[PDB]
Design an enzyme around this catalytic site. Structure first.
Site, short mmCIF file in Angstrom:
data_model
loop_
_atom_site.label_atom_id
_atom_site.label_comp_id
_atom_site.label_asym_id
_atom_site.label_seq_id
_atom_site.Cartn_x
_atom_site.Cartn_y
_atom_site.Cartn_z
N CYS A 5 -14.20 6.86 5.38
CA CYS A 5 -13.78 5.47 5.48
C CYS A 5 -13.93 4.95 6.91
O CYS A 5 -13.23 5.41 7.82
CB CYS A 5 -12.32 5.28 5.04
SG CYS A 5 -11.83 3.56 5.17
N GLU B 40 -21.95 -3.34 2.08
CA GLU B 40 -21.68 -2.74 0.78
C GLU B 40 -22.22 -3.62 -0.33
O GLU B 40 -22.62 -3.10 -1.38
CB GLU B 40 -20.19 -2.52 0.57
CG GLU B 40 -19.51 -1.59 1.56
CD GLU B 40 -18.01 -1.52 1.27
OE1 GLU B 40 -17.64 -0.79 0.32
OE2 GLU B 40 -17.21 -2.21 1.94
N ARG C 134 -10.54 2.68 8.77
CA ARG C 134 -9.22 3.27 8.96
C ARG C 134 -8.46 2.74 10.18
O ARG C 134 -7.32 3.19 10.38
CB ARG C 134 -9.33 4.79 9.06
CG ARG C 134 -9.76 5.46 7.77
CD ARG C 134 -9.92 6.95 7.99
NE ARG C 134 -11.24 7.27 8.50
CZ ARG C 134 -11.59 8.44 9.02
NH1 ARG C 134 -10.70 9.42 9.13
NH2 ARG C 134 -12.85 8.63 9.43
N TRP D 199 -10.80 -4.73 2.08
CA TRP D 199 -11.77 -5.83 2.06
C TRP D 199 -13.17 -5.27 2.35
O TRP D 199 -13.33 -4.17 2.88
CB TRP D 199 -11.42 -6.94 3.06
CG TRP D 199 -11.17 -6.49 4.45
CD1 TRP D 199 -12.12 -6.21 5.42
CD2 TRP D 199 -9.90 -6.29 5.07
NE1 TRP D 199 -11.49 -5.84 6.59
CE2 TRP D 199 -10.13 -5.88 6.40
CE3 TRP D 199 -8.58 -6.41 4.62
CZ2 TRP D 199 -9.09 -5.59 7.28
CZ3 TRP D 199 -7.55 -6.12 5.49
CH2 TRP D 199 -7.81 -5.72 6.81
C1 HEM Z 1 -9.11 -2.57 4.87
C2 HEM Z 1 -10.45 -2.62 4.92
C3 HEM Z 1 -11.36 -1.43 4.51
C4 HEM Z 1 -12.64 -1.36 4.85
C5 HEM Z 1 -13.42 -2.39 5.69
C6 HEM Z 1 -13.19 -0.13 4.31
C7 HEM Z 1 -14.50 0.27 4.46
C8 HEM Z 1 -15.06 1.30 3.74
C9 HEM Z 1 -16.46 1.50 3.46
C10 HEM Z 1 -17.60 0.58 3.95
C11 HEM Z 1 -16.56 2.63 2.75
C12 HEM Z 1 -17.86 3.21 2.19
C13 HEM Z 1 -17.80 2.75 0.73
C14 HEM Z 1 -19.09 3.02 0.00
O1 HEM Z 1 -20.15 3.13 0.68
O2 HEM Z 1 -19.04 3.12 -1.26
C15 HEM Z 1 -15.23 3.17 2.52
C16 HEM Z 1 -14.89 4.32 1.84
C17 HEM Z 1 -13.62 4.76 1.58
N1 HEM Z 1 -12.44 4.10 1.93
FE1 HEM Z 1 -12.24 2.46 3.10
N2 HEM Z 1 -12.19 0.54 3.63
C18 HEM Z 1 -11.04 -0.25 3.71
C19 HEM Z 1 -9.80 0.04 3.15
C20 HEM Z 1 -9.44 1.23 2.56
C21 HEM Z 1 -8.15 1.57 1.98
C22 HEM Z 1 -6.96 0.58 1.90
C23 HEM Z 1 -8.24 2.84 1.53
C24 HEM Z 1 -7.19 3.75 0.84
C25 HEM Z 1 -5.88 3.47 0.83
C26 HEM Z 1 -9.58 3.32 1.82
C27 HEM Z 1 -10.07 4.57 1.54
C28 HEM Z 1 -11.40 4.87 1.45
C29 HEM Z 1 -11.93 6.06 0.83
C30 HEM Z 1 -11.12 7.19 0.19
C31 HEM Z 1 -13.26 6.01 0.92
C32 HEM Z 1 -14.24 7.07 0.36
C33 HEM Z 1 -14.73 6.56 -0.99
C34 HEM Z 1 -15.66 7.52 -1.70
O3 HEM Z 1 -15.75 8.71 -1.31
O4 HEM Z 1 -16.33 7.06 -2.68
N3 HEM Z 1 -10.28 2.33 2.44
N4 HEM Z 1 -14.34 2.33 3.15
C1 LIG Z 2 -10.86 0.36 -0.29
C2 LIG Z 2 -12.32 0.05 -0.11
C3 LIG Z 2 -12.78 -0.82 0.87
C4 LIG Z 2 -14.15 -1.06 0.98
N1 LIG Z 2 -14.66 -1.91 1.90
N2 LIG Z 2 -15.00 -0.46 0.14
C5 LIG Z 2 -14.58 0.41 -0.80
C6 LIG Z 2 -15.56 1.03 -1.76
C7 LIG Z 2 -15.69 -0.13 -2.75
C8 LIG Z 2 -16.65 0.10 -3.89
C9 LIG Z 2 -16.95 -0.94 -4.76
C10 LIG Z 2 -17.82 -0.73 -5.81
F1 LIG Z 2 -18.09 -1.76 -6.64
C11 LIG Z 2 -18.41 0.52 -5.99
C12 LIG Z 2 -18.13 1.57 -5.13
C13 LIG Z 2 -18.70 2.72 -5.28
C14 LIG Z 2 -19.20 3.78 -5.43
C15 LIG Z 2 -19.74 5.14 -5.60
N3 LIG Z 2 -21.08 5.16 -4.98
C16 LIG Z 2 -21.55 6.54 -4.81
C17 LIG Z 2 -22.05 4.41 -5.80
C18 LIG Z 2 -17.23 1.36 -4.06
C19 LIG Z 2 -13.23 0.67 -0.95
#
Ligand code: HEM
Ligand SMILES: Cc1cc(N)nc(CCc2cc(F)cc(C#CCN(C)C)c2)c1
Ligand code: HEM
Ligand SMILES: Cc1cc(N)nc(CCc2cc(F)cc(C#CCN(C)C)c2)c1
Ligand SMILES: C[C@H](O)[C@H](O)[C@H]1CNc2nc(N)[nH]c(=O)c2N1
Ligand SMILES: C[C@H](O)[C@H](O)[C@H]1CNc2nc(N)[nH]c(=O)c2N1
Ligand SMILES: [Zn+2]
Lengths: 415, 410
Positions: free
Chosen positions: A113, A290, A116, A285
Site C-alpha cells: 500500500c 489505478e 499508508r 481513495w
Molecule cells: C487512503 C488512501 C489510500 C490510497 C491512496 C491507497 C493506495 C493504494 C494503491 C494504489 C494500492 C495498489 C492497488 C492495486 O494496484 O490494486 C493499494 C493497495 C493496498 N492498500 Fe492502500 N490505499 C489507500 C487506503 C487504504 C486503506 C484504508 C487500507 C486498509 C485499511 C489499505 C490497504 C491496502 C492493501 C491491503 C493493499 C494491497 C491490496 C492487494 O494486495 O490486492 N489502503 N493501496
Molecule cells: C483501500 C484502497 C485504496 C486504493 N487507492 N486502492 C485500492 C485497491 C482498489 C481496487 C479496486 C478495484 F476495482 C480492483 C482492485 C483490484 C485488484 C486485484 N488486481 C490483481 C487486479 C483494487 C484499495
C-alpha cells in the site's frame, strides 16, 4: 538474522537503517536461493488452543506497549483474561480499543500500500454483532455513505464477526464493494469490465437481472455465518460516479467513460492476534493510475488505448512512435481532471509517491522500519520519475495484517 | 520442488525446474525479501569444485558428459590447480562461459540475443597500452557503422588480488560532468567524481556538455593510465523530434554504444575483473534515465517549457507528457541515423518470447522484475504482468568494488 539492515535511495544517497524486520512473522516466499518478489500470491482448519495462546499474547503485548502500559496491572490482567478465554472457549474476543488498534496496524503493515501515510486516520466500524446478510447489507451501505461523504472521501473499514470453526464464515463475495459487470458475448467479445465476467455470471445465476450495459454496478453478494450468500442492490444514490472528460480534447467526453469514486477492497482477511476476520471491507481513495492505467488501458480490461490513439490521430503502425505511451498520459490526465472538477478525492502518482517516501522515512525514524513491496509501490506508468523507483525497500510480514484468502465460491458448501 | 510462474494478462503458466541448479545467494530469506536492493551483501580447495561444476556443465552442453575428453579435462584442471593454485580456460570454455554469463544475467531484458555474442580473448594482455588497443578494436567491431554487434573483451583473470586488470570507467563511453563554482553541474552529474579523477590524473577537460571521457586503464595492478578513444570510433546521434522542430535546438546528443566495463565475469571459480561488454540501447535508458533522472541531465523542465505545458501542479502530468516526447525523439533519432536501438515495447515483447524459449529448452529463466520492467509505461508492457523467479546461476556477471577505493597507488 543480522540486527541492522540498510536501505539506500539512489537519487538522494539517503541511507536508512531497519531494525523492525526482527519482528517479522510469517514467510515471504523467498529463500536464500530464490526470490519470489514478483509472485502475486506466493477449510474447517482453524487455530488450535496451542497455536492461539502465543499469537494473542504477542498482539496484546504489542497493544499495551503502544499505549505505554507494558507490564502494567491492566496488561497482566488482560493477558490472564485472554488466556482463560482461549482455555474455556478455544477463542477470545478483542476489546473495542484493540480492534481499532489492530485494524489500523494491519493497514500500517500492508507492504503493498502506497497510501499508508494516512494509516492512523482510519474510521473503524465494529460489525461483530451482525448475524444476517441483510444486516451485512445495512452495515456496508453505512460504510459506503460514510466513506464517500459526498466526494470528500474518508478511509474506513467495517469488521464482521471473526471465524469460529471455519464452516460459519462471514464473507463478502464481491472482490470490491463497487465494480462494473462484465458480459461474455456469443461472438467472444466482452461488454463492460472483462475482469468481472466470472463473478457477474455467479450473480446472474443467483438471480440478478443484468441490465447488460458497459458500466452496470454489480450487486452485493453477502454471506453471513456460513449460510448461502444473498444478493442486494446498492442504492444508486450511494454510488458516486465521475464522467471522464479531458481539459483539452472536447471529443474525450464522447467516449462515454465514467468510473466510481470509492475503491473498497472486500475480499481480504484481517488477522489480529491470531483471530481471523474473513469479512473486513476497507476503503480509501483512488490514485489516478489505478483507473487511468490499469482499469482503462490493461489489454484484458477496458483496453481503450486503441480508440484514444485513433481520436488523437497517432501513427499506430510502429510501436516506436510510442503512440500507446502518448495516449496513456492523456487518459490519466483526463481521469485526474474529471475527479478534481467534481470535487472527488483522488491523488496523482507523483503526490502519492512523494508522500509515501516521507511516510517511510518517518517510520524508519520512529518505528525502526517500514515494510514495502517495491513491485506494487512503484506506479504502473512513469515509474522512474517518481521517487519510490529509486528507493530501496525491504519487504517482510508484520502482524496485524491483511491476507489473501480463497474465493468463497471455491470453498462454500451450498445448503 | 517445481515452481510455477503465471502471466496475469495471458494466464500462461510456466514451470521452473532450473532454479534447482542455483547456489549463490539471492540476498533474501524466508522472512525478508531484498528484491529491490541493488547490491545485497580462492585457494585450491575452494576452486576445484567450482571448476568441476563448470566443466561438468560445459561437457553436458556439448553432449559428452562423462566422456574421455571430459575426464581428461577434469584431471588436467586438478593437476593445474595443485601446481599453480589456479587454471586457465580453454578457448571453447571461455566463449561458452561468457555467453552463459549473459544468458544468466537476471537483470537484462536483452537476453534473447545471448548466443550471438562475439567473444574477444584478451588474456595475453600485459599493459594498459595493450588494453587500450583491445578496447579500440572492441568498440570499432561492436559499433559497425551503426549496425551494432554484441561483444565482450576478456582481460586476464585475477591471480592474487594485487595484480588486477581493471577498466576504471564504469562504461567505455560516457560524458564528463563538472561541478560548477555557482553550485550546479555541467555535463553528466553521475560522472562528476570520475571526471575529477581524470582531471587529477592529467586529463585536459574541454568543459563542454558532451565531452567523451578518456579511458582510464589499469593492467596487472599498476597505476591506471589515460587514453583518448579516437573520435571516429565514437558514434553519436544528435537528438531531434519528428514534430517539434525546436527539439534540435535543445542541443542534445548521445553515444550509440552502451558498454559496461565495471563488472566482474565469473567462470568456473575464475574471476575476470576486466571484461567490458556491449550491446545496443533500449531507448528508455537514454530518454528516461539519462535525460530525466533528477540527478542526471534533468531536462524535463526545459522540454515541458517548450511544450508550454501547465507546470504549476503535478496532476497536470506535465512530467509524464514531456517524458514520452523525449523518448519519441531518441528512438526517431537513432532510427533516422540507422543506429541500432530498440523501444521498450519491442524489447519486452522479445523478452517474453525469450522466457518461453528458456522454460521449454532449459526449464526456467532467472529474471529480476525490478530491473526488467521499463522505467516508463510499465503496465502497458507485457513483462509487467509476467511473474518471474530470480535466482543466481553461474557463470555470472557480478558487481565489484570501485577501483579507486581499493587501489594502493604507486
Ligand atoms: C487512503 C488512501 C489510500 C490510497 C491512496 C491507497 C493506495 C493504494 C494503491 C494504489 C494500492 C495498489 C492497488 C492495486 O494496484 O490494486 C493499494 C493497495 C493496498 N492498500 Fe492502500 N490505499 C489507500 C487506503 C487504504 C486503506 C484504508 C487500507 C486498509 C485499511 C489499505 C490497504 C491496502 C492493501 C491491503 C493493499 C494491497 C491490496 C492487494 O494486495 O490486492 N489502503 N493501496
Ligand atoms: C483501500 C484502497 C485504496 C486504493 N487507492 N486502492 C485500492 C485497491 C482498489 C481496487 C479496486 C478495484 F476495482 C480492483 C482492485 C483490484 C485488484 C486485484 N488486481 C490483481 C487486479 C483494487 C484499495
Ligand atoms: C544486445 C542488446 C542488449 C540490450 C537491448 C540490453 C538491455 C539491457 C538493459 C535495458 C539493461 C538495464 C541497464 C540499466 O538500467 O543500467 C541491461 C542490463 C544488463 N545487461 Fe543487457 N542488454 C543487451 C546486451 C547485453 C550484453 C551483450 C551483455 C553481456 C555480454 C549484457 C549483460 C547485462 C547485464 C549483466 C546487465 C545487468 C547490469 C547491472 O546489474 O548493472 N547485456 N540490459
Ligand atoms: C550491454 C548493455 C546493453 C544496454 N542496452 N544497456 C547496458 C547498460 C548501459 C549503461 C550505460 C551507462 F552509461 C551507464 C549505465 C549504468 C549504470 C548504473 N546505474 C545503476 C545507474 C549503464 C548494457
Ligand atoms: C507479475 C506482477 O507481480 C503483477 O503484474 C503485479 C505487478 N505490480 C503491481 N502493482 C500494483 N500496484 N498492482 C498490481 O496489480 C500489480 N501487479
Ligand atoms: C531501488 C531500485 O532497486 C533501483 O532504483 C533500481 C530499480 N530498477 C532499475 N531497473 C533498471 N533497469 N535500472 C536501474 O538502475 C534500476 N534501478
Ligand atoms: Zn525476495
Amino acid at each position: 538474522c543480522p540486527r541492522f539492515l540498510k536501505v539506500k535511495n539512489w537519487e538522494t544517497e539517503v541511507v536508512l537503517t531497519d531494525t523492525l524486520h526482527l519482528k517479522s512473522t510469517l514467510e515471504t516466499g523467498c529463500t536464500e536461493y530464490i526470490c519470489m518478489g514478483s509472485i502475486m500470491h506466493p477449510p474447517e482448519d482453524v487455530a488450535t488452543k496451542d497455536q492461539l495462546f502465543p499469537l494473542a499474547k504477542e498482539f496484546i503485548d504489542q497493544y499495551y506497549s503502544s499505549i505505554k502500559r507494558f507490564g502494567s496491572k491492566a496488561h497482566m490482567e488482560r493477558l490472564e483474561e485472554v488466556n482463560k478465554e482461549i482455555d474455556t472457549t478455544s477463542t477470545y474476543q478483542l476489546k473495542d480499543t484493540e480492534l481499532i488498534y489492530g485494524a489500523k496496524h494491519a493497514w500500517r503493515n500492508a507492504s503493498r500500500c502506497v497510501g499508508r501515510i494516512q494509516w492512523s486516520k482510519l474510521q473503524v466500524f465494529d460489525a461483530r454483532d451482525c448475524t444476517t446478510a441483510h444486516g451485512m447489507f445495512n452495515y456496508i451501505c453505512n460504510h459506503v455513505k460514510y466513506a464517500t461523504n459526498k466526494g470528500n472521501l474518508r478511509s474506513a473499514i467495517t469488521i464482521f464477526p471473526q471465524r469460529t470453526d471455519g464452516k460459519h464464515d462471514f464473507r463478502v463475495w464481491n472482490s470490491q464493494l463497487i465494480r462494473y459487470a462484465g458480459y461474455k458475448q456469443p461472438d467472444g467479445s466482452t461488454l463492460g469490465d472483462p475482469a468481472n465476467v466470472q463473478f457477474t455470471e455467479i450473480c446472474i445465476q443467483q438471480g440478478w437481472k443484468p441490465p447488460r450495459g458497459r458500466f452496470d454496478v454489480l450487486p452485493l453478494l453477502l454471506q453471513a455465518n456460513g449460510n448461502d450468500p444473498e444478493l442486494f442492490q446498492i442504492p444508486p444514490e450511494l454510488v458516486l460516479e465521475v464522467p471522464i472528460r479531458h481539459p483539452k480534447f472536447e471529443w474525450f467526453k464522447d467516449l462515454g467513460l465514467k468510473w466510481y469514486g470509492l475503491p473498497a477492497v472486500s475480499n481480504m482477511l484481517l488477522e489480529i492476534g491470531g483471530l481471523e476476520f474473513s469479512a473486513c471491507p476497507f476503503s480509501g481513495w483512488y490514485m489516478g493510475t489505478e483507473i487511468g492505467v490499469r482499469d482503462y488501458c490493461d489489454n484484458s480490461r477496458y483496453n481503450i488505448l486503441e480508440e484514444v490513439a485513433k481520436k488523437m490521430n497517432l501513427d499506430m503502425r510502429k510501436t516506436s512512435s510510442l503512440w500507446k505511451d502518448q495516449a496513456l498520459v492523456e487518459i490519466n490526465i483526463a481521469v485526474l481532471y474529471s475527479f478534481q472538477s467534481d470535487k472527488v478525492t483522488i491523488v496523482d502518482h507523483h503526490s502519492a509517491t512523494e508522500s509515501f517516501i516521507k511516510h517511510m522515512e518517518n517510520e524508519y525514524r520512529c518505528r525502526g522500519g517500514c515494510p514495502a513491496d517495491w513491485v506494487w509501490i512503484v506506479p504502473p506508468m512513469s515509474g522512474s520519475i517518481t521517487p519510490v523507483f529509486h528507493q530501496e525497500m525491504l519487504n517482510y510480514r508484520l502482524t496485524p495484517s491483511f491476507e489473501y484468502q480463497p474465493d468463497p465460491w471455491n470453498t462454500h458448501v451450498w445448503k
